[PDB]
Design a binder for this molecule. Structure first.
Ligand SMILES: N[C@@H](Cc1cc(I)c(Oc2cc(I)c(O)c(I)c2)c(I)c1)C(=O)O
Length: 383
């Protein structure tokens, strides 16, 4: 088995999130097929539910995996994902899609992906973090490359065939799953965690809007767009390097003392989102995309260490579970509201601005977290 555990974990992490991020390239043609009324409002749910259900289901998997074992639940996740992707075929209306794609597919994907971490632990009972960086660099490949394959694949055979063929990834995941073989509400009393856990979800209330609506905002330059997929590929091409660099950066002395760089990340990503609906020359959009992706990777990379910095090591699991439970909502509610925001009398021009407000509030809230304080001074002032 050996290193193949990490090798297959790479494939799993790529397979799930590459699709979840290429969702837009599906959406652009899914809207066209079996098209209308008020379609843009309904369709967004197809990807919104898919992205929300993974986070909603991740915490509960911590009971299933511990109940059945590490080897299981990965086979089951892969099989359920394959069943859902296949069932997405033979659908003559958009209504069943919410159930075939989304609910079923993500309820499979979360089961497939969650146990990967528990077995990356014990990879070699050492050298954690470096393995995670390797896996991130690997999944960067699938995030970068998949949009190119799907874009050319769609025109040859329609959406139905595309989803019926994407089952190859789930099948390979199912086969690789055989490698795995091993060989609570009291948290809120901590004020720092209480503030942070509300700050982050309030910050991400527009994070997933671009990943869904950017490919449809494109075609504003209907003629000059000799190539579209690059504009979405260059988000991941920068996210990979950003995560890789910030993994190294996090622990270095000049900035490891107490990290609040997530405030900077939110500020920059919000500003760049506020920049999209204005730039006209093509290259400016790619520059904005790179600026977005770099900090998008940085913020996600820096998250986990803050978890055990704020709270003891024992409660990190519960902390992450609650955090993902809260995070389930904003990504489900974002894209639909963003689409509808001016689906009457306008375009995304008026919708991308308001997608940029929540990040600033989130950054302020996170910057409003106390520290460097202890109660030994309580004798002096308030008593
Ligand atoms: N849109 C992103 C997808 C993505 C979102 C989040 I939020 C995230 O952060 C975590 C951290 C831990 I730790 C988890 O167990 C989980 I599940 C998600 C990661 I990694 C990836 C992209 O472009 O790839």
């Amino acid at each position: 088995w050996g290193w193949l555990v990490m090798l297959a974990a790479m494939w799993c992490n790529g397979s799930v999130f590459g699709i979840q991020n290429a969702c837009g390239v599906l959406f652009v043609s899914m809207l066209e097929t079996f098209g209308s009324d008020k379609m843009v409002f309904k369709t967004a749910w197809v990807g919104s539910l898919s992205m929300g259900m993974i986070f909603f289901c991740c915490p509960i998997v911590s009971v299933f995996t511990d109940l059945f074992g590490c080897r299981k639940t990965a086979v089951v996740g892969a099989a359920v994902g394959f069943v859902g992707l296949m069932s997405s075929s033979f659908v003559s209306s958009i209504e069943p899609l919410y159930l075939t794609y989304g609910i079923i597919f993500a309820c499979g994907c979360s089961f497939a992906y969650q146990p990967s971490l528990v077995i990356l632990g014990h990879y070699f009972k050492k050298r954690l973090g470096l393995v995670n960086g390797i896996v991130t660099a690997g999944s960067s490949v699938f995030t970068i490359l998949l949009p190119l394959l799907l874009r050319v694949l769609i025109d040859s055979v329609g959406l139905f065939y595309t989803l019926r063929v994407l089952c190859i990834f789930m099948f390979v995941l199912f086969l690789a799953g055989f490698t795995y073989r091993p060989l609570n509400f009291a948290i809120f009393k901590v004020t720092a965690y209480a503030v942070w856990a509300v700050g982050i979800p309030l910050a991400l209330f527009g994070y997933f809007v671009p990943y869904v609506h950017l490919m449809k905002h494109v075609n504003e330059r209907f003629q000059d767009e000799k190539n579209k997929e690059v504009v979405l590929m260059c988000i991941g091409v920068t996210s990979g390097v950003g995560r890789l660099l910030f993994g190294r950066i996090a622990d270095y002395v000049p900035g490891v003392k107490k990290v609040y760089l997530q405030v900077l990340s939110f500020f920059f990503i919000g500003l760049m989102s506020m920049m999209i609906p204005l730039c006209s020359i093509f290259g400016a959009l790619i520059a904005v995309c790179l600026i977005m992706g770099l900090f998008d990777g940085c913020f996600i990379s820096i998250m986990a260490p803050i978890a055990f910095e704020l709270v003891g090591a024992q409660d990190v699991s519960q902390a992450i579970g609650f955090l993902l439970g809260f995070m389930s909502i904003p990504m489900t509610v974002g894209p639909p509201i963003a689409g509808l925001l001016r689906d009457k009398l306008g375009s995304y021009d008026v919708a991308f601005y308001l997608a940029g407000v929540p990040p600033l509030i989130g950054g302020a809230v996170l910057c409003f977290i106390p520290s460097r304080l202890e109660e030994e001074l309580r004798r002096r002032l308030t008593e």
